[PDB]
């Protein structure tokens, strides 16, 4: 129930603890992690209608028009009005101008005192070719909100291109409403409970996994990265679904177990810590809001190589079930508590990350543009998503520690490990790794 | 209508002029064109039922059990009974072992007098992983026959795994009946007319296209090569279909015009010759038969760079419509008549080929099928673009001769083709030079 | 003595009975058996001088410019001049490009009427890195001639690069003179005697060795294969050379006995036939020529498991000594006279081969080209080197997986140790000891 008005300074929610200005780094800059979306629109596009669809979308969701101000040693959020938001138009000559503009437009800084938190550009190449650029600061909204945003934008464009009017269901809940409702159902007792659980769980855990890289770890992190591409056939994915369903688990647990099995080849550690972002939407009134509902949990797994994959699956199921009950406390709290002195040479509390993204006549075609920022916050980052023709995704690595060929071999090993898990229903981790290694020179 | 009795010799069809033993090469071997088809089976497979499904496939299609006997200075085809065919079983440990076994199995020779024209291997890895291998000589059946083969194989296996009896459509006619009908439905006047048309159409054309290559052309072709992949997004494919249907043509003409536009950047020739295999199944009955129904036609296009792409599209539509009217005479006869002595350095009458493959059209304990790569390492032409249309866009590969090209040049060619399709979509009235310049914003490859 | 004039036609030698076009296979191709020879040249290389070195090398050796003409039911050889030969230059960027170019270049055909029997390519990678490629058909010259070829090429390049004059030993005779002399000596009586000896020696022998294979033997050989490496330390090689000396034998006999001991674990037969190429240059004048002097002889050994290794070594002594007295008759004639109707499933008269080859600014790094070809079931080729024994075990991919062949190679390397330590043990005892 709405408890906010104009000019109200409302407290930040639990998930706004890492927006963009609370994670400053001296050697990187203040805007190194701006999130940019680039698309190519193919077909006869009405520029004015499409821009007015963006304006209506910004006026609909209140997060895109929210500001923040410093209040002593903490920060607060403030809601502005939609006046002053305009879609910029530029004429470009070819793809070289487009890529130069994309490269020179993302790193321009956002400010907490800025009144609109969205920048929209429409680049016109020909009357049948347009590029839409959406860039926003970190911590504004997540991938689920990105899908909602894109679907709503498509609906608004289809409605508004003609003489019609925007016709969408209203949003009874604003983000500040969710913040207040969460904050009143959140006390020192629950915070202390979850911090105690996570300090007990992350006990006696090495500060950095013994990942045998290619190049010796630098004394300081440069935060430069790249990515290799991952593909899994649809038949293998269907068999993985069948395997997971009859074992009592889910697909995420199976893929996390496979990732843990892969990383056992690059380290001799008995325990492995992998970070994993989860969504926090515990209410039927929150599947349409555009906002940041992502909290990172750390998963600990036992990767002894003489055990069966079934035992690893059961352990991963138990760990995942336990972790989902204590996902309220922010990760930054755990970083501050359990890591007093962070070493600039590696990330705190984990160095690898696994992320399963949720699925989800005059027409227009949309081809996403390649957006490779070159940033890698951790040593490794496997982001995969379910698709009708199998599993698609990529593996992001820090360029200081690994060579491209080794990361390619790792991705191929993951793809072969999934098949070997499917086809060998009783093998051990070492047996599965040996079976996957027979790739025919890769 | 069926006009052949059991154990009757029948004449060869026009498309059977390209089998494998009528086109031998001294330094290459008789089995250098063997076609191998390997795929992986995931799930609980009944090996014996699958072998019986293969045997039923062999017993159902009489091309798979047809011999070729020499009568005078020509050949005739005889159909045998299915007895003698068997599936071979091997236990294989690993995937590199599978690759070595596949490389060893493919070049094994086939004989024209052999009673069956098929080899089937089932390789057991685990009780839930098998590899099925099918090998045949060239000229036995084509890709549409491969689709029919796979579909009826799956149907037979579903019928046989449980204690049922197969329910498959009865085949109206045999391939020998088709050959007899084709022999009756011409009195050598149509053949002479098609000779005349193709002799007039291909006249005054250079013997070899003046393509620019990385390496110098040897005095004798080696017939080795590899390929690089081609990928086009589904949105671009849909917009290409929209444009092609607006212009009144088909998608094949648009893709062929795009290929002709790409090739004009690597040659100073004003006019190109591109060969393309086409299907000739001119009755409803033959549409489900397993056999060879393919002929190759040479496409002659004018690629002057100052013309609009619409003019090239119209010319391609005209040429393609004209070529499909004279597609019954074999390409080998054209080579014999127009190229009395062929230069061993290059292939006759064309050196680049374009092929658009027709598109291929849920139990709880079902089986998964994953195709396995088959890198034959062969190259019959300088360049060979093979693409097929899929629900997720356009898939294919660009095959090239390793006597002439490095891999980076062919990668650049494929990327330029993929960019050219998009630039064709987004720029209606641009010329060929403008299209090439717009597509050239790809970072030098 | 030279008995050949310009433009004279000479008869074919006995060793020329297996060139490449007298042994064609229909399904394989005429050029499936070409020999490709690639090296890497590191340092500042004068390319024109090195090509001129190749031209002078082709002019020096008359086998490289010899044609073969059909006169009746047989062939004759004619020597041409050095005009028409040239080195081909290419700019290549990368190593995968070099590999692909090498794979493309080898299978190009050779014709018997060609004036030159070589193809030389110089691939420029950088102005300080080059790749030299030499390709020839089968039956032109052997490994001894390859060593002579390389040494003389290097000498010519060293002489020509620094503006000097070439100084090479004069060739006393030419290969056609050797063929003329051979026709005079081995005419009608030695042929009959050797044919009778080989008919008596290879009688009552199984058609095919009953080896145990991973896969079922196909109805027709495909001639595809691979290989695995074989490595032996120098101390072991020295001990083997010593233990051969105490018996009066040589290293070849000891290695052949060890190879036969290895094969007895995979076969239940009491008799083995092993083929082995043999050098035949029975004159001082023939030691420096470039040509083909190789013949294949069949060695028949008894491998009963209760005998000691000493008895097998003595039997190898006897058999090897007896075979070298009858090495003039070609192997093809023996196959024709002994195997009238060959079986396409296997090779004639033997299926396993053992080949021991004799031992041998800019830096040179060879580029190993694996052809993927196998003419027999198994083929052990070992080279003697200062650091030990180097070579490979080539196997047919129709019959064997790689793991079995690697296990065989490791067992052979261990069996050499077991032979060195205790030569008095039986064959079964050494087999059990070496299986660990």
Q: What is the CATH classification number for the domain harbouring C284?
A: 3.30.559.30
Which residue among B88, B90, B103 sits closest to C397, beta carbon to beta carbon? B103
Q: Which of C121, C57, C59 is nearest to C89 (CA)?
A: C121
* Whether C345 contacts chain B with CB within 8 A: no
Q: Yes or no: say if B316 and B257 are a contact pair by the CB < 8 Å rule.
A: yes
Pairing mode, if any, of strands C294-302 and A35-42? unpaired
* Whether C33 contacts chain B with CB within 8 A: no
Q: Do residues A171 and A221 share a domain?
A: no
Strand partners, C388: C233, C385
SS3 B386: strand
Residue of C nearest to B106 (CA): C222
Distance CA B295, CA B16 (A): 10
Number of independent structural domains in chain C: 2
Q: Which of C413, C63, C33 is nearest to C223 (CA)?
A: C33
Burial C249-267 (b: 16+ CB within 10 A, else e): bbbbbbbbbbbbbbbbbee
Query: The domain spanning residue C75 has which CATH number?
Result: 3.30.559.10
Distance CA C239, CA C418 (A): 11
Token duo for residue B40: 């992986």
Q: Do residues B107 and B252 share a domain?
A: no
* Whether B372 contacts chain A with CB within 8 A: no
Token duo for residue C219: 């109805």
Residue A177 has φ and ψ, to the nearest 5°, of -60, -50
Touch of B by C (3+ CB pairs closer than 8 Å):
yes
Per-residue HEC secondary structure of B64-79 comes to HHEEEEEECCEEEEEE
Asked if C107 and B218 come within 8 Å (Cβ–Cβ), the reply is no
Which residue among C30, C32, C402 sits closest to B97, beta carbon to beta carbon? C402
Q: Do residues A244 and A388 share a domain?
A: yes
Distance CA B445, CA A382 (A): 28
Distance CA C377, CA C275 (A): 12
Q: Do residues A156 and A266 share a domain?
A: no
Q: Which DSSP state fits C19?
A: S
Asked if B107 and C222 come within 8 Å (Cβ–Cβ), the reply is yes
- Single out the residue in C150, C178, C206 at which a domain terminates: C178
Distance CA C223, CA C394 (A): 12
Q: How far is A378 from chain B (nearest CA, A)?
A: 30
Q: Which DSSP state fits C211?
A: B
Strands, sheet with A10-11, edge to edge from the N-terminal-most edge strand: A10-11, A74-79, A66-71
Asked if B105 and C222 come within 8 Å (Cβ–Cβ), the reply is yes
Which residue among C88, C100, C222 sits closest to B104, beta carbon to beta carbon? C222
Strand partners, A365: A42
Domain interval for residue B89: 10-178
Residue B213 has φ and ψ, to the nearest 5°, of -115, 170
Distance CA C300, CA C273 (A): 5
Q: Do residues C158 and C217 share a domain?
A: no
Query: CA distances (Å), B275 to each of B161, B353, B381, B408, C117, in order?
Result: 44, 5, 10, 24, 36
Burial C195-208 (b: 16+ CB within 10 A, else e): beebeebbeebeeb
In a domain, A433, yes or no: yes
Q: Yes or no: say if A212 and A267 are a contact pair by the CB < 8 Å rule.
A: yes
Q: Do residues C51 and C96 share a domain?
A: yes
- Name C422's Cβ contacts closer than 8 Å, sequence gap at least 6: C430, C433
Q: Which of B300, B355, B295, B356 is nearest to B331 (CA)?
A: B295
Q: What are the chain A neighbours of B428 within 8 Å (beta carbons)?
A: 128
- Name A361's Cβ contacts closer than 8 Å, sequence gap at least 6: none
Q: Yes or no: say if B13 and B178 are a contact pair by the CB < 8 Å rule.
A: yes
Q: Which of A294, A283, A279, A277 is nearest to A15 (CA)?
A: A294
Q: How many CB pairs under 8 A join B and C?
A: 91
Question: Which of B39, B40, B41, B42 to probe the A interface (max A CBs under 10 A)?
Answer: B42
- Name A336's Cβ contacts closer than 8 Å, sequence gap at least 6: none
Q: C66-75 — which CB contacts under 8 Å span 24+ positions?
A: C66/C117, C66/C175, C67/C112, C67/C113, C67/C114, C67/C115, C68/C12, C68/C19, C68/C21, C68/C112, C68/C113, C69/C9, C69/C112, C69/C113, C71/C9, C74/C11, C74/C12, C75/C12, C75/C22, C75/C112
Asked if B426 and A236 come within 8 Å (Cβ–Cβ), the reply is no
Q: Yes or no: say if C236 and C295 are a contact pair by the CB < 8 Å rule.
A: no
**Residue B338 burial (C-beta neighbours within 10 Å; 0-12, 13-18, 19+):** middle
Give chain A's length: 442
Residue B117 has φ and ψ, to the nearest 5°, of -105, 35
Percent of chain C as helix, strand, coil, to the nearest 5 = 35, 25, 40
Q: Do residues B220 and B173 share a domain?
A: no
Query: CA distances (Å), A287 to each of A19, A387, B274, in order?
Result: 21, 21, 55
- With the C-alpha atoms ordered C95, C97, C103, C107, is the resulting torsion angle positive or negative? negative
Asked if B100 and C32 come within 8 Å (Cβ–Cβ), the reply is no
Q: Yes or no: say if B135 and B141 are a contact pair by the CB < 8 Å rule.
A: no
Query: CA distances (Å), A328 to each of A176, A195, A199, A332, in order?
Result: 17, 10, 15, 12
Distance CA B41, CA B55 (A): 18
Interface of A with B in 99-138 (CB under 8 A): 125-126, 128-129
Method: cryo-EM
In a domain, A200, yes or no: no
Q: Yes or no: say if B121 and B105 are a contact pair by the CB < 8 Å rule.
A: yes
Burial C387-400 (b: 16+ CB within 10 A, else e): eebebbbbbbbbbb
Dihedral in degrees, nearest 10, Cα atoms A93, A95, A97, A99: 160
SS3 C83: coil
In a domain, B246, yes or no: yes
Touch of B by A (3+ CB pairs closer than 8 Å):
yes
DSSP code per residue over A188-249:
HHHHHHHHHHHHHHTTT--SS-----SSPPPSS----EEEEEEEE-HHHHHHHHHHHHHTT-
Distance CA C176, CA C11 (A): 8
Q: Do residues A268 and A168 share a domain?
A: no
Residue of B nearest to C98 (CA): B406
Distance CA C191, CA A108 (A): 93
Distance CA C129, CA C333 (A): 47
Query: CA distances (Å), C247 to each of B262, B315, C300, C318, in order?
Result: 74, 86, 20, 12
Q: Which of C114, C119, C94 is nearest to C38 (CA)?
A: C119
In a domain, A203, yes or no: no
Tokens 């080794």 correspond to what residue? A406
Helix and strand tally (H, E) in chain A? 11, 14
Q: How far is B313 from chain A (nearest CA, A)?
A: 20
Q: Do residues C292 and C423 share a domain?
A: yes
Q: Yes or no: say if B41 and B130 are a contact pair by the CB < 8 Å rule.
A: yes
DSSP code per residue over B10-75:
EE--SGGGGSSSSS--TTT-TTTT-EEEEEEEES---HHHHHHHHHHHHHH-GGGGEEEEEETTEE
- Name B157's Cβ contacts closer than 8 Å, sequence gap at least 6: B49, B50, B53
- With the C-alpha atoms ordered C86, C91, C93, C96, is the resulting torsion angle positive or negative? negative
SS3 A77: strand
Q: How far is B398 from chain A (nearest CA, A)?
A: 21
* Whether B28 contacts chain C with CB within 8 A: yes
Angle of the A309-323 helix axis to the A251-263 helix axis, nearest 10: 120
Q: Which of C117, C122, C31 is nearest to B216 (CA)?
A: C122
Q: Do residues C371 and C430 share a domain?
A: yes
Q: How far is C166 from chain B (nearest CA, A)?
A: 32
Q: Which DSSP state fits C386?
A: T
Q: Do residues C267 and C118 share a domain?
A: no
Question: Which of A365, A438, A442 to probe the B interface (max B CBs under 10 A)?
Answer: A365
Distance CA B373, CA B375 (A): 6
In a domain, B63, yes or no: yes
- Name A68's Cβ contacts closer than 8 Å, sequence gap at least 6: A19, A75, A76, A77, A78, A112, A113
**Residue B62 burial (C-beta neighbours within 10 Å; 0-12, 13-18, 19+):** buried
Distance CA C50, CA C59 (A): 14
Q: Yes or no: say if A143 and A358 are a contact pair by the CB < 8 Å rule.
A: yes
Asked if B426 and A129 come within 8 Å (Cβ–Cβ), the reply is yes
Strand partners, B294: B279
Q: What are the chain A neighbours of B393 within 8 Å (beta carbons)?
A: none
Q: Rounded to 5 degrees, what angle do the CA atoms B320, B325, B329 make?
A: 110
Asked if B233 and A367 come within 8 Å (Cβ–Cβ), the reply is yes
Chain centroid, CA C25 distance in Å:
19
Phi and psi based region of residue A393 (left: phi greater than 0; alpha: psi -120 to 50; beta: remaining) = left
Distance CA B257, CA C364 (A): 50
- Name C12's Cβ contacts closer than 8 Å, sequence gap at least 6: C68, C74, C75, C76, C77, C179
Touch of A by C (3+ CB pairs closer than 8 Å):
no
Percent of chain A as helix, strand, coil, to the nearest 5 = 35, 20, 45
Q: Which helix (H) or strand (E) holds A385?
A: strand A380-387
Distance CA C76, CA C65 (A): 14
SS3 C279: strand
- With the C-alpha atoms ordered B193, B194, B195, B199, is the resulting torsion angle positive or negative? positive
Distance CA A50, CA A385 (A): 29
CB neighbours (10 Å) of residue A14? 19
Interface of C with B in 133-162 (CB under 8 A): none
- Name A270's Cβ contacts closer than 8 Å, sequence gap at least 6: A302, A303, A304
Token duo for residue C88: 């081909």
User: Partners for B (CB, 8 Å, 3+ pairs)?
Assistant: A, C
Q: Do residues C136 and C225 share a domain?
A: no
Residue B170 has φ and ψ, to the nearest 5°, of -75, 130
In a domain, B81, yes or no: yes
Token duo for residue C155: 């000498």
- Single out the residue in C178, C209, C244 at which a domain terminates: C178
Strands, sheet with B294-302, edge to edge from the N-terminal-most edge strand: B225-232, B393-401, B383-390, B352-357, B271-279, B294-302
SS3 B390: strand
Q: How far is B103 from chain A (nearest CA, A)?
A: 13
Distance CA A123, CA C261 (A): 78
Helix and strand tally (H, E) in chain B? 11, 14
Residue of C nearest to B402 (CA): C104
Distance CA A131, CA B397 (A): 29
In a domain, C3, yes or no: no
In a domain, C393, yes or no: yes
């Amino acid at each position: 129930v709405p408890v906010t008005g104009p000019g109200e300074e409302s407290p930040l929610s639990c998930q706004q603890s890492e927006l963009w200005f609370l994670n400053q780094r001296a050697h990187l800059g203040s805007s190194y992690d701006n999130v940019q979306m680039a698309y190519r629109v193919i077909g006869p596009l009405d520029r004015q209608a499409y821009a007015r669809a963006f304006e209506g979308l910004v006026a609909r969701h209140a997060v895109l028009r929210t500001s923040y101000l410093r209040r002593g040693d903490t920060y607060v959020q403030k809601v502005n009005d939609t006046t002053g938001f305009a879609v910029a138009f530029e004429d470009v000559t070819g793809d070289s101008a487009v890529t130069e503009f994309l490269r020179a437009e993302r790193p321009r800084p956002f400010d907490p005192a800025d009144r609109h938190m969205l920048r929209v550009h429409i680049l016109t190449l020909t009357p049948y070719e347009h590029v839409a650029v959406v860039t926003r600061p970190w911590g504004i909204f997540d991938g689920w909100s990105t899908g909602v945003f894109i679907a709503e934008l498509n609906a608004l464009y289809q409605a508004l291109s003609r003489g019609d009017e925007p016709s969408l269901p209203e949003l009874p809940v604003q983000y500040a409403d969710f913040a207040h409702w969460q904050r009143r159902t959140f006390d020192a007792d629950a915070r202390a409970r979850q911090q105690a659980y996570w300090r007990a769980q992350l006990a006696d855990l090495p500060s950095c996994t013994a990942l045998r890289t290619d190049y010796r770890r630098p004394e300081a992190k440069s935060y430069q990265g790249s990515s290799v591409e991952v593909n899994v056939p649809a038949a293998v994915l269907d068999q993985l679904k069948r395997v997971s369903k009859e074992r009592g688990g889910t697909l995420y647990m199976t893929l996390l177990s496979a990732f843990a099995t892969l990383l056992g080849a690059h380290t001799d550690d008995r325990e492995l810590a992998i970070g994993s972002p989860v969504t926090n939407r515990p209410r039927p009134e929150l599947e349409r809001l555009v906002g940041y509902f992502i909290n990172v949990l750390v998963m600990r797994l036992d990767v002894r190589p003489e055990q069966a994959f079934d035992d690893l699956l059961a352990q991963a199921q138990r760990v995942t079930a336990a972790a989902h009950e204590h996902k309220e406390v922010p990760f930054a709290d755990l970083v501050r508590d359990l890591v007093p002195e962070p070493d600039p040479a590696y990330s705190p509390l984990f160095q690898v990350m696994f992320n399963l993204v949720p699925a989800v006549p005059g027409a227009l075609g949309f081809v996403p543009l390649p957006t490779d920022s070159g940033t890698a916050k951790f040593d490794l980052n496997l982001v995969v998503r379910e698709t009708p023709d199998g599993l698609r995704g990529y593996l992001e690595y820090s360029t200081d520690l690994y060579a491209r060929s080794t990361v390619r071999s790792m991705a191929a090993t993951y793809e072969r490990l999934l098949l070997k898990i499917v086809t060998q229903p009783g093998a051990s981790l070492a047996r599965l790794r040996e079976a996957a290694a027979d790739g025919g020179a890769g």
